[PDB]
Design a protein around this ligand. Structure first.
Ligand SMILES: CC(C)(COP(=O)(O)OP(=O)(O)OC[C@H]1O[C@@H](n2cnc3c(N)ncnc32)[C@H](O)[C@@H]1OP(=O)(O)O)[C@@H](O)C(=O)NCCC(=O)NCCS
Ligand SMILES: CC(C)(COP(=O)(O)OP(=O)(O)OC[C@H]1O[C@@H](n2cnc3c(N)ncnc32)[C@H](O)[C@@H]1OP(=O)(O)O)[C@@H](O)C(=O)NCCC(=O)NCCS
Ligand SMILES: CC(C)(COP(=O)(O)OP(=O)(O)OC[C@H]1O[C@@H](n2cnc3c(N)ncnc32)[C@H](O)[C@@H]1OP(=O)(O)O)[C@@H](O)C(=O)NCCC(=O)NCCS
Ligand SMILES: Nc1ncnc2c1ncn2[C@@H]1O[C@H](COP(=O)(O)OP(=O)(O)O)[C@@H](O)[C@H]1O
Ligand SMILES: Nc1ncnc2c1ncn2[C@@H]1O[C@H](COP(=O)(O)OP(=O)(O)O)[C@@H](O)[C@H]1O
Ligand SMILES: Nc1ncnc2c1ncn2[C@@H]1O[C@H](COP(=O)(O)OP(=O)(O)O)[C@@H](O)[C@H]1O
Lengths: 375, 375, 375
C-alpha cells in the first residue's frame, strides 16, 4: 500500500484537519482517529503501572513530519517534542531530498553487547584465552534460555574478551556476548544471557563475576542514511545553490574540527531523532548515550554526519550511528500512542525504524546548517 | 517554608492520594491540584503554537521522587519518564543519603558560549590578536541590546578566540562570547549577541562571519553535587556495608576504565536528570549533548561521576557536568505543568534547578551501581 | 609629553653624546644624567643588602634601542646585555615597523596563580568539590590580609582545583588561587595568600597542605603584540620585498615544525625581552621559565611568535606569552638605574612594561629571521 508522505498545506490546517488527512492516507480506523483526537490516550492506571509514584501524566506536543522517503518508500513520521522549527525543518529538508530520490539507508545487524565483568583473577590473559577456548560452549549456554529468539533468527553469535590489566582496583577481564536481538531493544534479553553464563565463566577463570549488563555503546547496531541535493534544488533568492552547498560543507568542517561546534551540530541531529524515539515508546536516554559516546570513539568528540560535494557538484550527506530501538517491549507495547505511531509509519522491523530515525536526524542536521548558511 | 520531602507509603497510595499529599505539603491550591488530576493540562491550541504540524499530544507518565535534600533544604522532584524503577531508585538513594546530611551542591556561574566563526582570513593569528585588542569594545557591543539582562546582573563578560589553522576549508577563527545568562537557558540571547557583533568582527579581521551560534558544550555552566553514605547505612541482609561500598567503587572504576561501560553508567545518570528536565519544560537534547560531550573532554569517553572511600570508610560520590537549564522561556513558560513543576520544587533560580537535577542524577547512578553490586 | 623615539646617528655618537640626547628627549635632570654617566650607580652597601656574600658588582653594558612605538606612543627602551647586534637589530626592525604604524599591543589581566598542594586525601574528587563549594569563603580569606591591593583594584578573583589521582606519592589536589596583582610581580603577595588559606583548606579536605607557592607558568598574565611590514618596506638591493616576506614566513614555519629550530627562534625572542627585564630590575629567570614552559603547552615545544602574509601581501607578526614583570618591589625599587629605566620609558603600569617588552621580543625575532633570509 504505497502512500504519499507529502503534507500539503499542513501549516494552515487545524489539528483536526491534519488528523483527518493522516487517517485517510495511512488508513486509521475511527477508534485510532479518536485516540489521537482526545487527550488522555494513556490511561492513568496504565501510567501507574509503568513507573513509580505516578501523580498524573505530562504531555508533549505530538506532530507529524512530511515528505520522508526511505529506500523508495514514503513514510509519515510522528514526533513528540517541545521545541519550535524542528518539525518544519525536517519536512523542508525531506521535501528537497525528493528530487534526487529521498533517503537511502542500511543497517548493520541488530547486535547488542552484554558485558560480563570478572575481577580477582591473577592471570587475566590466561583467563581470557580460557574463555575464548570455551567460546562455543558459552555461546550455547547463552542461547539456552532464549528458544523464542533463536527461533526468530536471533541469539548470541560470538564472544569477545577484553583485558584491562592496570586499574586502581586490579586487573579486570570483560567478556562481551554479541547478541542478535531481532526486533527488541534487547536489554533484558542480553542481561539475562550475561547472568546465565556467569557461573560457568567463574569456573573457567577462577575469578568473581561482578557486573552482568548490556553496553549502551551499541556500535555493532548501526543505522546509516545518505541523501543528495543539487545546486538547482538548494538555490534561494539570495544565494546560488553552489554557494549554499559550499557554506553547508564549510559548517560541517567546523563541526568536524571543533568539539564546541560538534556538540551543537550533533544536538541538532538528536532534535530530529529523539522525538521519533519518544513517540514510539523507546528509551531516548539509551539512544542519546550511544550516539554521543560513538561520536567520541576516535579520541576526539566529532560530527555524527558528513557533508561532501560529489563529482557532479551535488551536496551529499551521510549519517551513521548506534540505533538501539525496538518494537516489542516496554512502553512501545504499553503506550497506546506508541503502537499507533508504529502503525502510522507502517514499520515491521526495528531495523526499519532505526533507519527512518537516522534519516530524520540527517535531514534535521541539514535544516540547521542550511539555515545558518542562508542567514 | 521548610517541607519534608519524605514520601511515606507512596508505593501503596493511589495517584489521587499521592496528589492530595503533595498538594498539602507544597501548598498547591485547588486549581493546581485539578490541573494534575485530569488529563489535558496542555491545551491543544497551546500545543499547536509550540511546534509545527500538531495532531495531538503524547503523554509521559508523571511522578515525584522523594527524600531529596539539597544544601539542607528538602525538595520534592517531579519526573516525566517511561521506564520502571528509575523513580523508586532515586527515592531510595536519596532516603539513604539523609543520615550524612543529603546532597551538597554548587555551581560555576550561568555562563554560556556564543561562537562567532570567521572564514577567509589570510593572517588568522594576526586577526585573533586584533579581536583581543578590541575586546572591551566588542563586549560592550554584545551588551548593547540586552539592557534587561545587564540590569539583572548578567551579560557578556569576556571574549576568547581560537584559531584552527589547518582545516580542509582553510583557516578558521572562532571567537567565543562568554555570557552570563542569569535564569535563562540563554540560546536566543547569546545567538543575538553573536549576530550583533558580527559586522564589527568582519571589519576588524577582514574575514567573513559565517556561523553565529551558541555552543551546547556548556563547560562554563557546571553543576556539582556530592553525597556520602556510611557502611552501616549501606548494609544489607546479604552484604556487609563495607562490601557494598567496595563493590560500588569497583563498578565505578570499571566505567572510568572502559568506554563501553561508561556509556551505560552515564546513561543511568541521565535516567535521573532528563525526566526533571522534561518535566520543567527544558530541552533535554541540549542537556544530553552537553553531558556526553563533556564526558569525552579528556580524550577518552569516561564517567561523569566519581565514587571514593573516605578516610573514615564512608562512600563518597561526586558529579559535575554542564547544566544549561532555565526558568524563563520556552516550554518552561508555556506548558502549564512545567510552571507547576517549578512550584512543586520551589525553585527560584536556574542555578538551583541545575543543582537539584545533577543530585538526582548522582542518586540514580548509585541506585544502579548498588543494585548491580547486591545482585 | 609625546617624544620621538628615533635615535638619529646613534651609531656614530659617543656614549656621552648619546646620554645628552636621551636626557634632553625624555627629560632627565642633571643628577639622573650623572647617575648613568659614571660607574657605580648601585652603591656597594645597597648591593650588599640585595643578595648574600657580596664582594662587589658585575657590570653589563647598558644601551637604548630606538624607534619603538607602542599603541601610537613612542618609547625609548633601555637594554642591559652582553651580546652584539641585538640592540641594533631591535632598532632596525622597530624603524621599519613605523610605516604601518609601529606595534599594536594588548594584555590579559595581571593575574598570577598561587598553588596550594594537598596530600594525604583518600577522596580527592570529593575534597575538590568541597573546596569549590566553599570558594567564596576562601577567596574572602585570601583577600583578608591585602586591603591595600584590594583597594587598588586587585586581589584574589577565583579558585580552581586540579586533581592528580595517580602519582607515585598518592593522589594530590592542587588548588589555584587566581590573583590580580596590579603593578607588582606578585610572588610574595600570592605566596602569602596561599599561606593564609592553608589551614582552612586542611579543615575542609582532611588533608595536609604541603606547598603554598606561586606558579611561574603565568599563562593568565599574557602580553601580546602585533606588527606589520609591506614589501616595499622590506625590499633590499638583492631581494624583492615579496621574497623577503616569503623567506621570513618559511623560517617561521621551520620553527613551528621543529623543536631544534624553535629553541633557537625563541632564544632570539628572549635576546630582546630579557635585557629590558634586567634593566628594570625584574627577575629574568621568571620571565624565561614562563616563556619557554608556555611554548610547550600544546604538547610540543614550538614558536612563541607567528609570521603570516596578509590579504594585501604585507608581512604580519604576532607574539603572545606570559609576562610577569612589576614596577613596585625587589630590585626595581632598590636599584637606582632600574628606577631610571622606568622613567626613560615613561611607564606607569606593569601591563605597559610587559607590552613594551614583548614588542621588543617580536622585533628581535624578525631581526634574526630577516637577516637569515637575506644571507
Ligand atoms: C522553519 C523553516 C522550515 C521555514 O522555512 P521558510 O524558508 O520560511 O520556507 P517556507 O515557508 O517556504 O516552507 C518550506 C517548507 O518548510 C515546511 N514548513 C515551513 N514552515 C512550516 C510550518 N509552519 N508548518 C509546517 N511545515 C512548515 C513545509 O514543508 C514547507 O513547504 P510545503 O508547505 O510545500 O510542505 C526554515 O526556516 C528552516 O528550515 N529553519 C531551520 C530551523 C532549525 O534548524 N531548528 C532547530 C534549532 S533552531
Ligand atoms: C527498585 C528498588 C528501589 C526496590 O528496592 P528494594 O530493595 O526492593 O527496597 P524496598 O522495597 O525496601 O524500598 C526501599 C525504598 O525504595 C523506594 N521504593 C522502592 N520501591 C518503590 C516503589 N514501588 N514505589 C515507590 N518507591 C519505592 C522507597 O523509597 C522505599 O522506601 P520507603 O517506602 O521507606 O520510602 C531497588 O531494587 C533499586 O534501587 N533498583 C535499581 C533500579 C535501577 O537502577 N533502574 C535504572 C535502570 S534498570
Ligand atoms: C646588525 C644590523 C642591524 C646591521 O644592519 P645593516 O643592514 O648593515 O643596516 P644599516 O647599517 O643600514 O642600519 C639599519 C639600522 O639598523 C640600526 N643599526 C645598524 N647598525 C647599528 C649600529 N652599529 N649601532 C646602532 N644602530 C644600528 C639603525 O637603526 C640603522 O638605521 P638608523 O641609523 O637610520 O637608525 C643587521 O645586520 C641585523 O639586523 N642583523 C641581525 C642581527 C641579529 O639578529 N642578532 C641576534 C643573534 S646573531
Ligand atoms: N520480533 C521479535 N524480536 C525479538 N524478540 C521477540 C520478538 N517477538 C517476541 N520476542 C521475544 O521478546 C523478548 C524480548 O521482549 P522484551 O524484553 O519485552 O523486549 P525489549 O528488550 O525490546 O524491551 C525476546 O527475548 C524474545 O523471546
Ligand atoms: N531572571 C532572568 N534571567 C535571564 N533573563 C531574564 C530574566 N528575566 C527576564 N529575562 C529576559 O529574558 C530574556 C531571555 O528570555 P527567553 O529567550 O524567552 O529565555 P530562554 O533563553 O531561557 O528561552 C533575556 O535576554 C532577558 O532580557
Ligand atoms: N601599584 C601597585 N600594585 C600592586 N601592589 C602595590 C601597588 N602599590 C603598592 N602595592 C602593595 O605592594 C605589595 C607588593 O609589594 P612587593 O612584594 O614589594 O612587590 P613585588 O611582588 O613586585 O616584589 C602588594 O601586596 C600591595 O599591598
Amino acid at each position: 500500500m504505497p502512500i504519499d508522505s507529502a503534507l500539503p498545506n499542513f501549516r494552515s490546517l487545524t489539528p483536526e484537519q491534519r488528523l483527518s488527512h493522516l487517517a485517510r492516507v495511512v488508513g486509521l480506523d475511527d477508534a485510532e482517529h479518536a485516540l489521537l483526537a482526545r487527550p488522555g490516550a494513556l490511561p492513568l492506571d496504565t501510567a501507574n503501572g509503568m513507573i513509580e509514584n505516578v501523580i498524573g501524566t505530562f504531555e508533549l506536543p505530538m506532530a507529524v513530519t512530511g515528505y520522508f522517503r526511505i529506500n523508495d518508500r514514503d513514510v509519515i513520521v510522528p514526533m513528540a517534542v517541545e521545541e519550535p522549527s524542528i518539525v518544519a525543518a525536517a519536512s523542508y529538508m525531506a521535501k528537497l531530498s525528493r528530487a534526487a530520490g529521498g533517503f537511502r539507508t542500511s543497517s548493520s545487524g541488530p547486535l547488542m553487547r552484554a558485558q560480563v565483568q570478572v575481577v580477582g583473577v591473577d592471570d587475566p590473559y590466561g583467563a581470557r584465552l580460557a574463555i575464548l577456548r570455551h567460546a562455543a560452549e558459552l555461546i550455547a549456554l547463552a542461547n539456552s534460555r532464549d528458544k523464542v529468539l533463536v527461533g526468530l533468527g536471533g541469539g548470541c553469535r560470538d564472544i569477545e574478551v577484553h583485558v584491562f590489566p592496570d586499574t586502581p582496583r586490579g586487573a579486570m577481564i570483560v567478556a562481551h556476548l554479541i547478541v542478535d536481538v531481532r526486533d527488541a531493544m534487547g536489554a533484558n534479553t542480553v542481561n539475562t544471557m550475561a547472568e546465565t553464563v556467569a557461573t560457568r565463566i567463574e569456573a573457567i577463570t577462577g575469578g568473581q563475576v561482578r557486573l552482568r549488563i548490556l553496553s549502551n555503546l551499541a556500535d555493532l547496531r548501526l543505522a546509516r542514511a545518505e541523501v543528495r541535493y543539487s545546486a538547482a534544488t538548494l538555490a534561494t533568492d539570495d544565494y546560488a545553490g553552489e554557494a549554499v552547498i559550499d557554506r553547508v560543507i564549510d559548517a560541517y568542517v567546523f563541526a568536524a574540527t571543533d568539539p564546541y561546534r560538534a556538540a551543537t551540530h550533533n544536538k541538532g541531529i538528536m532534535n530530529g531523532i529523539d522525538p521519533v524515539v519518544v513517540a514510539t515508546g523507546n528509551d531516548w536516554r539509551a539512544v542519546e548515550a550511544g550516539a554521543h559516546a560513538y561520536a567520541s570513539r576516535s579520541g576526539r568528540y566529532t560530527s555524527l554526519t558528513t557533508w561532501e560535494k560529489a563529482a557532479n557538484g551535488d551536496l551529499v550527506g551521510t549519517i551513521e550511528m548506534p540505533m538501539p530501538v525496538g518494537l516489542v517491549g516496554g512502553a512501545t507495547k504499553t503506550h497506546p500512542l506508541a503502537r499507533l505511531a508504529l502503525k502510522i509509519m507502517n514499520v515491521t522491523s526495528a531495523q526499519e525504524l532505526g533507519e527512518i530515525a537516522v534519516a530524520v536526524g540527517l535531514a534535521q542536521n541539514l535544516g540547521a546548517l542550511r539555515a545558518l548558511a542562508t542567514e
